[model samples]
Target: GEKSRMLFERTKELFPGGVNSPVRAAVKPYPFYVKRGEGAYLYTVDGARIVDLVLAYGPLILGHKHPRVLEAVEEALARGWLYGAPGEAEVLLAEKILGYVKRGGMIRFVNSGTEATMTAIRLARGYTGRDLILKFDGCYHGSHDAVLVAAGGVPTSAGVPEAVARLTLVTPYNDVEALERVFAEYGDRIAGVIVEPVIANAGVIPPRREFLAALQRLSRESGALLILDEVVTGFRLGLEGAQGYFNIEGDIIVLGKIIGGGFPVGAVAGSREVMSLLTPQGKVFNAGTFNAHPITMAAGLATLKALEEEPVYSVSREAAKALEEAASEVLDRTGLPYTINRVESMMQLFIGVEEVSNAAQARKADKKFYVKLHEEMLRRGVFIAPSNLEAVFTGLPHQGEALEIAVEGLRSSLKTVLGS
Candidate 1:
């Protein structure tokens, strides 16, 4: 504990707010600095081994230090980190990625979901010869200037220009009428309608079946491309991501997270006509030094191979369902107002509510109550995301006695928060 406190104190002075990313700063007081992760848990510098339910915010689907991933990384490390040139690994990874994106014509790997999205916007604009973009409220597409506008309670980031912010319009998720109105007014000028199909960033709200249909239909009718941000859902929701889960297609698909097997990776993929616009192929410029790094490619290949060879999806989904049931049972018995929105290995607990279909409704839930419950669960050694806006992620290793521990701990934590 002393080491953790001291490390955090030193980090605070060294880095902005003691964190490289805002999500890491979500913990109140101070976050525990992790020493290492094994299987489904995190070992803290404080010598506390806590059950990890966030899983690096939904990236470690196969769980921490997966042998296959580690092996691949070791092999790649022996070879090199970057070649600053092309390799077969990138080609093989691209082929594998295309398997999931059935409508894909081409793919270009980037460094993060943000890079992929920023690239997508440029590509869409270049291809369609338009400037404006439509995005859903609360569906975070990363902190890039364009997509970062009008989300997370702040109207827009300070540095994002007003002109750039004005070009990007925000509509409520799952609100078909509002979306229709936006299209009616500015549809022709819009280059693309970018969306997070599952809305995982807004606490796990799934798109309404009809709402997804409307997005596709309107985007097509208006001659604007539909960009699906699958940075959170890709491979985790299923091999095809939310598009397959919802039975739809997008003109552009952005991917990140699990695909990299916990490595930093991102991609923008779509039909040849659109993706061809990238530099060296057409006119729009897109370049990255770390693009298709050998280590990342090998790690991604290993992860996808492992997913195919084993019952990773089924096992992880079952675990998520069980955990949701366990948490719900405790909530029901305690008679606390709550609703858990879940899909496969991801779920969100909206306190003081029965349901939430959009960000407005999601905002209505009790964050103070969730913060109290989060602190209680943390004290019991079951760690979830520090922010209520995030989802709890389950992995292949979270089952049997470890899972039982989580359920019982959740029950006890709920009792502590809501009273017996």
Candidate 2:
């Protein structure tokens, strides 16, 4: 704790809020500086061993420093980390992804989820010759100009021009009637309808049974490209991502997180006809110096290979289920009015609300109580997201003793917070 405090004191002068990212600064008092991660644990500079349920905000699907991914990166390092030219590893990873994404014929790599969505939006406008984009409320598609309107909280960032915000339409999630009203007025003018298959940013609020179906039909009828922002749900939901799981396909799919195997990566993929619009073939320009960094490709390829051969999905799912059940039992005993929304290996527990199917309902859930729960859990040796709007992610290494610790922590934390 002393070391982390000292580091934060020194860091505040150098970096904004003493952290590189805004969310990292959300940890009250000061964020614990991580020394290293192994399996499902983070060894903090303060010498605290925390069960890392955040898992680097959903990138480490195999958990930290997985041996196979490490080996692959080491092998790639032996070859060279970067080349500034196309490499075979990229081609291999693309091919592997294509095998799962049946509708996708091609892919373009980018540095982050924000870049992938930005490129996808630009491609949609370029191909369709339309200007407006429609996005759901509380569905965060990275911090970019077009989709930033009404994303998470903070309605439109400061620098985003009003003109840009006007081009972006925002509607509440799981509300088809509202979406229809917007489409009725400007359906033809809309370039794309970008949505997170499941609203992970709003703390794992799942789509209504017919919500995604309605979106697909409307976008198709209106000739607007349906862009599935699968940055969080891509490989975590399943090999084919949310599209396959939900039986709804998007014209363009944006991927990140697990695809890079904990590296900084993002990909926009679609049919050949649509993706060919990107540069070197068509006029919609996009290029990155680290587009397909060799080490990242090696790590991604190895991660996918491991997913195919190992029990990563089942183990992760079970770990999340265990924690959810434990939390439910604890809350039931307290007779508290709360809702827990879970989908596969991702979930969230919201206090003071019986239902949370959309952003409006999610906002109604008490934030203070959730933060208290987070602090209590952290004190009990488990780490969840500090922000109430973020999900609790479980990964391959979150099993056995690691999972037991998380379950015990959640149970004890809820008891302490609820005073039962």
Candidate 3:
């Protein structure tokens, strides 16, 4: 604890809020600096071994330092980390990913989800010869100027130009009538309609039963490309991601997280007609120095290979279910009106709320209480997301003893937060 506090003190002098990311600063007092991660646990600089339910905010689905990913990266490093030119690993990884994509026939790699979504938006506009882009409220598609119009309580960021903000339309998630109104008003001018099939950014709120299907139909009817921003739900939901799980397909799919096996990677994929619109192929521009880094390709390929061969989906889902049940059981005794929304291996507990079906309701839930619960869980040697808006993830290593520890921590933390 002393070492972590000392490090944070030094870091605050160098970085704003002592963290490169905003969410990491949400940890009260100071965030524990992780020395290394192995399996489901993180060894902190303070000598605390925390059960990691954050899982690097959605990547590391196979868990930290997985053998397959490590071995693959090591092997790739021996060959060289980058080439600047085409590499065999990127082609193989692309082939592997395309095999699982129902709507995608071509792919382009990027360095982050932000880049992928930004490029997808440009590609949609170029392909359709339209200007407007429609996105739902609270559906975070990274911090790009186009999609940051209505995320996180701000109508638009201070630095975003008014003209840029006006080009992007905003609507509420899970509300079909609102979407219908937007389409009715701007259908012909809209180039794309982007959505997070499952809203993971606002505390894991699932889409309404017919919401996604309606979105698909409306986007097609209005001649707008449907861009599914599956940066969070991509491989975490299943091998085929949300497209396969919901039986709904998008015109463009943006992927990140587990695909890179804990490396920095993002991909924008779609049919050849739309994907061909990027730079050398068409007119829209997209270039990155580390677009298809060799290590990332090798690690992503290995992660996908392991997912296909192992019982990762089942095991991780079961672990999340166990924790959800445990938290539910403890909360029930307290007679608190709360909701726990879960999808496979990702879940979040919102206290003082009966139902959280949209961003407005999620915002209304007691955030302070959730932060208290986070602190209590940390005291019990478990580490969930410090922010209420993030999800608690379970990966391959979260089984048997590690899972039991998480369940117990949930139970005790709930008791402490809810007061028996």
Residue-level error in angstroms, candidate 2, position 173: 0.5
Q: What TM-score does candidate 3 get on C-alpha atoms?
A: 0.98
Range of the 10 consecutive residues with the lowest summed lDDT in candidate 2: 147-156
lDDT of 1 by residue, 115-222 (tens): 999999999999999999999888898878888787332347787777778888888999999899999989999999999988888788988988998999999999
Error of 3 at 39 (Å): 0.1
Instruction: Report how far residue 416 has shifted in candidate 2, in Å.
Output: 0.5
Q: Give a tens-digit lDDT track for model 2, residues 161-195.
A: 77778888888999989889989999999999999
For model 1, the local distance difference test gives 0.87
Q: Estimate each model's TM-score.
A: 0.97, 0.98, 0.98
Cα lDDT, model 3, residue 14: 92
Note the clash tally of each candidate.
0, 0, 0
RMSD of each: 1.6, 1.6, 1.5
Clashing residue pairs, candidate 2?
A: none
Clashing pairs in 3: none
Model 1 worst lDDT window (10 residues)? 148-157
